[PDB]
Scaffold this active site. Structure first.
Site, PDB file in Angstrom:
ATOM      1  N   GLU A  59      67.057  -4.292 -26.736  1.00 56.30           N
ATOM      2  CA  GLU A  59      67.755  -4.988 -27.812  1.00 56.30           C
ATOM      3  C   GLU A  59      66.785  -5.418 -28.902  1.00 56.30           C
ATOM      4  O   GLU A  59      67.093  -5.317 -30.096  1.00 56.30           O
ATOM      5  CB  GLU A  59      68.492  -6.200 -27.251  1.00 56.30           C
ATOM      6  CG  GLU A  59      69.601  -6.729 -28.132  1.00 56.30           C
ATOM      7  CD  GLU A  59      69.935  -8.172 -27.820  1.00 56.30           C
ATOM      8  OE1 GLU A  59      69.241  -9.071 -28.339  1.00 56.30           O
ATOM      9  OE2 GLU A  59      70.877  -8.409 -27.038  1.00 56.30           O
ATOM     10  N   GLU A 136      60.892 -16.855 -27.658  1.00 56.19           N
ATOM     11  CA  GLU A 136      62.325 -17.096 -27.783  1.00 56.19           C
ATOM     12  C   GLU A 136      62.928 -17.585 -26.465  1.00 56.19           C
ATOM     13  O   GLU A 136      63.861 -18.398 -26.469  1.00 56.19           O
ATOM     14  CB  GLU A 136      62.999 -15.829 -28.305  1.00 56.19           C
ATOM     15  CG  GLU A 136      64.484 -15.710 -28.101  1.00 56.19           C
ATOM     16  CD  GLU A 136      65.016 -14.429 -28.704  1.00 56.19           C
ATOM     17  OE1 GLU A 136      65.118 -14.360 -29.948  1.00 56.19           O
ATOM     18  OE2 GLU A 136      65.288 -13.480 -27.945  1.00 56.19           O
TER      19      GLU A 136
END
Lengths: 445, 420, 78, 101
Positions: A59, A136
């Site tokens: 992704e 993240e």
């Protein structure tokens, strides 16, 4: 000029199959824009605890360069045509979305085919996205709701591939290489597991011609007949309590096992979730809210907010409620939420069921207002049901829903069932699992 | 008439726009030019308490009746407030849209405004301001308007803490009776009949006065404020005066904003065509986010740069952004990049109009501002009619104009306005 | 006359801050007392932005829109 | 009728709460609806109501009554809590109707 007539006037979708089994679906509207997306039936359900972060890495790395347009040429083309690009991945699905004008459909579908077919995985980009993914995940650790839903998934599906999160553990992120990513691409990005969905000002003949032009070479066959296989995931009743008293508020999610995607009880359970309702402290309803849980929450100033969820996977799911409150109202909120659940279980009211049916109809239609939610629903529907369930069919099921079968379905799924409890924060007042079970059965019924 | 938008103007100044799209849910919106900009220093926060008082007891429907009837229908009551104007919207099934219009017009035309209700509502006002000031961008742009205007746009969109506990029912009634009139309203509707909208308009909206209070023309002041609050990231917005709504200069400013970078088109992207993102990433290796801020109103505008940077690298990020805009003002830009910016602006406008809620907001804003509906083809035509010399002129105007700066964070290295 | 008290007559206790760590024998006028100041509400903490990819898009580019509703969460649009 | 007014005045004197300076709305028992009405009262009417009740309690403690000139009269006995109480009753009736439906 009635509701059923308007829902019949909603234009139906068109579904076709390529020669390799790639599904191509479209809904044509009068909008001057379009949303074109690719859905892959892959995720953490298919990942096997060794490449648990491979889908999330792909992704990240899907738009950092390909064979035909390496580096930032893809970004230059997308921002030149003005398209807004998105990608996401849940435990069962991976979706790549492009919203653009209707005239840029060949360029959009060429970009999507290039992304999902010829993705280039350069090792320096792998290292950079590894560091980005680590930071993240640090941010998501500092988040609060995602932590408790991940805890709920882990404690509800322990020992099964549904427990592992989409991002994957930190050592696995540090451990994956390009070989694992290429193996994930060659194993899970097969032709019959993708739906190319278009919504808006697109013609289905043009979309099918472009799909035959670009996405006809996917190599649906496997390497050494290494065909994966879906397995049922064992739900368990359990609790996970991450106590950390320095946090200001507490997050508690309590769920039970869902029915699944193809189960027709999902409509009744969504109506029941509309009965229980959702409330946030920034609301304007006040104490006069129709939801009794929201009304008592406003009256006693118990929780900051609560919401109800029904997440569905292949013959399984998590169905329940998640609330944020202070450290001195967790037991009261648990008691009131469980009492409302059993009021739905035992004494369901026809007027409130009609209220929930109206709420649910508004929910589906107001969600399906918009080309990118239409494309999203097309992708999910063809990946889960194998077909797009129309609005007329949804309204027919909602009309079939009444108070008696709501009572039966709620008693089947809620009453006397071992739940999954996830608590994060100052959860000392969060009651014991035996007390939660004792709330899960009633002594007056 | 699914082909065209029915449009009419009453002799009292009310505007009615309708569309028979045969949608399963119809939307009714009353858009009123009664934003926060129409307050002087004596009634600050009145628009915010009004926005939260859109669910109170009214002359024709109680608060309990309004809430229970709306959620029994399943419809949505929403209020969308800007500095310029407020918008009251009901959404629901077309079978219950008459009840929805009745509730909407009852709560927006004849509110009782009891003292006990607003006294209980001011705590919700405090909570709403806290939730809105959770993120730093809201506080930055409120501060930016506060130092950018002397009056009539520097009034905060949220109620000040001193005005909390002191807004009264007579103040609310005065604001409603002076700004909620027929000439400052537009009743738009998607999925409803124009005749039915005409009947509900002539049944509820013939008892309002006229043009009402004018305003205060929003004089500019310039200047800066810096709020040191120890955040990990420094947020700094530097703007200057620009054009108002209805100008080819404003269209040039929008094209300039999308040239300089108005947001990311790719999730986790590098913002390759974004000039300021490229210029900052040319000389930095830290997390940053730089964009172009554009905000036009009925009489004035604000164009500038917004930077979120590290505490140590804030000066370098701001100086790189300002140097990029100065190079654009000097003329360092290509026609291909201008065409790409125009494509970005056209796409953004079209996906804004795409959603039925956004379409309703757009047609209502057009009805309030211009009084007539401009088609999206005409909007794209004038966007294409924007030239690149106009973009250079807009950038030169921002460079040479007086500056308004709002900064917050750890400001040990954030430069001042005379240091730029 | 090199002192703040010798230069600013009535502005001496405004330019100067005096705190007695040990209380003296004589009390001064205007002892002062806080009138039980209230507390800001306990409310959720927002996620930080530790990476540039998540930081992107957080910069405001459009004017404020405040949205409230009967049963929808209040939203802030930049 | 005309006889009803004089007999009502005689009953008002015989009730005896005018002798302690009360009013009818001061004397009526504080149920939940009455609590809502008192909460809905403005500040000045609330302050005189609480002072009148406190003076009444003091006089009942002394087993005394106010002088005849300081007694409140039937003519000036204003019905201050009546519209607030009526509105609270109407809201409660609407809530009960919605619960029944």
């Amino acid at each position: 000029a009635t509701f059923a007539q308007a829902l019949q006037s909603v234009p139906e979708t068109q579904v076709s199959i390529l020669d390799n089994g790639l599904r191509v679906a479209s809904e044509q509207s009068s909008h001057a824009t379009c949303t074109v997306g690719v859905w892959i039936d892959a995720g953490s359900r298919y990942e096997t605890e060794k490449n648990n972060g491979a889908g999330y890495f792909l992704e990240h790395l899907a738009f950092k360069g390909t064979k035909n347009r390496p580096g930032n040429a893809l970004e230059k083309e997308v921002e030149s045509i003005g398209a807004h690009l998105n990608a996401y991945s849940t435990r069962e699905h991976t979706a790549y979305l492009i919203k653009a004008l209707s005239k840029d459909l060949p360029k959009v579908v060429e970009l999507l085919a290039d992304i999902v077919q010829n993705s280039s995985l350069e090792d320096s980009q792998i290292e950079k996205e590894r560091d980005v993914i680590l930071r993240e995940m640090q941010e998501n650790d500092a988040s609060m709701q995602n932590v408790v839903f991940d805890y709920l998934h882990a404690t509800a599906f322990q020992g099964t591939p549904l427990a592992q999160a989409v991002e994957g553990p930190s050592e696995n992120v540090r451990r994956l290489s390009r070989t694992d990513l290429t193996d994930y691409l060659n194993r899970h990005y097969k032709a019959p597991r993708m739906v190319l969905a278009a919504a808006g000002g697109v013609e289905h003949q043009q979309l099918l011609d472009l799909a035959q032009k670009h996405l006809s070479s996917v190599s649906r066959v496997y390497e050494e007949d290494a065909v994966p296989g879906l397995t049922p995931c064992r739900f368990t009743g359990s609790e996970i309590r991450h106590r950390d008293d320095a946090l200001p508020l507490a997050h508690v999610a309590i769920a039970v096992e869902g029915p699944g995607w193809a189960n027709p009880d999902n409509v009744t359970l969504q109506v029941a979730n509309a009965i229980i309702g959702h409330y946030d402290c920034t609301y304007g309803g006040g104490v006069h809210l129709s939801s009794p849980l929201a009304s008592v929450a406003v009256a006693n100033k118990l929780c900051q907010s609560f919401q109800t969820f029904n997440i569905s996977y292949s013959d399984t799911g998590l169905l329940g409620a998640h609330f944020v409150c202070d450290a001195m109202s967790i037991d009261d909120m648990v008691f009131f939420l469980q009492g409302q659940w059993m009021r739905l279980c035992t004494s369901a009211t026809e007027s409130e069921v009609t209220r929930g049916k109206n709420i649910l109809r508004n929910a589906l239609v107001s969600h399906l207002d918009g080309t990118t939610p239409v494309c999203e629903d097309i992708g999910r529907s063809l990946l889960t049901y194998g077909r797009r369930i129309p609005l007329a069919e949804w309204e027919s099921r909602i009309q079939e829903v009444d108070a008696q079968m709501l009572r039966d379905i709620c008693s089947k799924y809620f009453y006397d069932q071992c739940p999954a409890v996830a608590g994060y924060g100052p959860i000392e007042q969060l009651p014991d699992y035996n007390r939660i079970r004792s709330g899960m059965f009633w002594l007056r019924f | 008439q699914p082909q065209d938008l029915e449009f009419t103007k009453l002799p009292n100044g009310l505007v009615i726009a309708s569309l028979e799209n045969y949608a399963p849910l119809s939307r009714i919106g009353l858009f009123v030019k009664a934003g926060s900009r129409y307050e002087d220093s004596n009634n600050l926060g009145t628009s915010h308490l009004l926005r939260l008082a859109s669910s109170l007891t009214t002359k024709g429907a109680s608060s309990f009746k309004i809430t229970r009837g709306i959620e029994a229908v399943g419809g949505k009551l929403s209020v969308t407030a800007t500095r310029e104007n407020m918008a009251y919207t009901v959404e629901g099934i077309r079978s219950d849209i008459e009840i929805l219009m009745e509730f909407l017009l009852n709560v927006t035309t004849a509110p009782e405004f009891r003292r006990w209700e607003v006294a209980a509502l001011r705590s919700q006002l405090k909570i709403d301001k806290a939730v809105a000031f959770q993120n730093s961008q809201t506080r930055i742009i409120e501060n930016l308007h506060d130092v950018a205007y002397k009056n009539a746009l520097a009034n905060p969109l949220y109620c000040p803490d001193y005005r909390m506990g002191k807004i009264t029912s007579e103040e609310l009634h005065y604001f409603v009776q002076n700004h909620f009139t027929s000439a400052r309203m537009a009743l738009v509707g998607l999925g409803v009949s124009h005749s039915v909208l005409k009947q509900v308009a002539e049944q509820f909206l013939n008892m309002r006065g006229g043009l009402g209070l004018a305003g205060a023309k929003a004089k500019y002041r310039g200047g800066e404020i810096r709020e040191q609050n120890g955040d990990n990231l420094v947020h700094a917005a530097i703007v200057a005066e620009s054009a108002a709504i209805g100008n080819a200069e404003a269209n040039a400013f929008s094209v300039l904003q999308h040239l300089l970078g108005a947001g990311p088109h790719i999730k986790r992207g590098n913002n390759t065509t974004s000039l300021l993102s490229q210029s900052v990433a040319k000389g930095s290796h830290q997390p940053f986010d730089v964009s172009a801020f554009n905000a036009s109103y009925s009489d004035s505008g604000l164009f500038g740069i917004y930077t979120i940077s590290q505490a140590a690298a804030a000066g370098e990020v701001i100086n790189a952004a300002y140097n990029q805009v100065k190079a654009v003002a000097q003329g360092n830009l290509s026609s291909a990049d201008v065409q790409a910016a125009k494509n970005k602006l056209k796409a953004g406008y079209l996906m804004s109009v795409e959603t039925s809620e956004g379409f309703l907001s757009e047609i209502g804003s057009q009805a309030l501002a211009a009084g007539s509906y401009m088609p999206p083809s005409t909007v794209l035509q004038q966007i294409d009619s924007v030239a690149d010399a106009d973009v250079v002129k807009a950038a030169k105007k921002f460079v040479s104009g007086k500056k308004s700066m709002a900064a917050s964070g750890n400001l040990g290295h954030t430069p001042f306005l005379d240091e730029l | 006359m090199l002192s703040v008290a010798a230069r600013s007559g009535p502005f001496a206790p405004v330019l100067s801050a005096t705190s007695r760590g040990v209380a003296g024998a004589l009390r001064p006028l205007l002892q002062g007392a806080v009138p039980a100041a209230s507390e800001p509400p306990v409310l959720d903490v927002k996620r930080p932005f530790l990476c540039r990819e998540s930081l992107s898009g957080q910069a405001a580019a459009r004017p404020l829109v405040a949205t409230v509703g009967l049963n929808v969460p209040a939203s802030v649009r930049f | 009728s005309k006889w009803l007014d004089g007999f009502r005045k005689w009953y008002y004197n015989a009730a005896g709460f005018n002798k302690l300076g009360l009013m009818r709305d001061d004397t009526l028992h504080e149920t939940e609806d009455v609590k809502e009405a008192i909460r809905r009262l403005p500040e000045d009417l609330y302050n005189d109501r609480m002072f009148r009740i406190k003076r009444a309690l003091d006089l009942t403690m002394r087993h005394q009554i106010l002088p005849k000139d300081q007694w409140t009269k039937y003519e000036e006995d204003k019905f201050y809590l009546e519209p607030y109480l009526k509105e609270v009753i109407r809201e409660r009736k609407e809530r009960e109707e919605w619960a029944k439906k």
